[PDB]
Design an enzyme around this catalytic site. Structure first.
Site, PDB file in Angstrom:
ATOM      1  CD  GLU A  35      60.964  70.893  90.386  1.00 21.89           C
ATOM      2  OE1 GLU A  35      60.098  70.007  90.289  1.00 21.89           O
ATOM      3  OE2 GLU A  35      62.008  70.848  89.706  1.00 21.89           O
ATOM      4  CG  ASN A  46      59.336  60.978  88.710  1.00 22.40           C
ATOM      5  OD1 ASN A  46      58.938  61.956  88.092  1.00 22.40           O
ATOM      6  ND2 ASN A  46      59.856  61.066  89.920  1.00 22.40           N
ATOM      7  CG  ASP A  48      62.301  56.394  88.168  1.00 21.94           C
ATOM      8  OD1 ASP A  48      61.264  56.855  88.675  1.00 21.94           O
ATOM      9  OD2 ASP A  48      63.412  56.848  88.453  1.00 21.94           O
ATOM     10  CB  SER A  50      61.154  57.287  92.033  1.00 23.11           C
ATOM     11  OG  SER A  50      61.323  58.112  90.905  1.00 23.11           O
ATOM     12  CG  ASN A  59      63.198  60.804  92.746  1.00 30.01           C
ATOM     13  OD1 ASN A  59      63.905  59.807  92.819  1.00 30.01           O
ATOM     14  ND2 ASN A  59      62.080  60.830  92.047  1.00 30.01           N
ATOM     15  CG  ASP A 101      74.684  64.602  95.275  1.00 30.96           C
ATOM     16  OD1 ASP A 101      75.089  63.886  96.223  1.00 30.96           O
ATOM     17  OD2 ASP A 101      74.488  64.179  94.109  1.00 30.96           O
TER      18      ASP A 101
END
EC number: 3.2.1.17
Length: 129
Positions: A35, A46, A48, A50, A59, A101
């Site tokens: 990562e 990113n 989008d 973000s 994120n 999550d």
């Protein structure tokens, strides 16, 4: 800060990540490697709009507030810059929420594509833990 492999393994272990939610330490070290390459200061934007922050590339759309991601949810209740610190505590606390999550470590695309189903044990080999 750019962590060493065994140095990070040890810090993650001390922070309660070894076997958290069933994920051995090797999984976390492998995911950090791909990562961010063990760099706490890594950021990646990113499509989008973000941005991913820190050693675990968390994120801004859901987990932290960076002040520039419309609709961000800030579930870890922290400014994204806190995730770039040399102290990995915030990154670790937030990751614990992410992995819980429901989708487990699949939340990290590099883990899913490069660690999952591999001999993750190799990542902590030789370390004094």
């Amino acid at each position: 800060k750019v962590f060493g492999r065994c140095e990070l393994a040890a810090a993650l272990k001390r922070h309660g990540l070894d076997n958290y939610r069933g994920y051995s330490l090797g999984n976390w070290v492998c995911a950090a490697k791909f990562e961010s390459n063990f760099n706490t200061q890594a950021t990646n934007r990113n499509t989008d709009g973000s941005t991913d922050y820190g050693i675990l590339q968390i994120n801004s759309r859901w987990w932290c507030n960076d002040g520039r991601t419309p609709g961000s949810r800030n579930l870890c209740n922290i400014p994204c810059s806190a995730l770039l610190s040399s102290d990995i505590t915030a990154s670790v606390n937030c990751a614990k929420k992410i992995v819980s999550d429901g989708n487990g470590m699949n939340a990290w695309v590099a883990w899913r594509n490069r660690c999952k189903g591999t001999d993750v044990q190799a990542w902590i080999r030789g370390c004094r833990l």
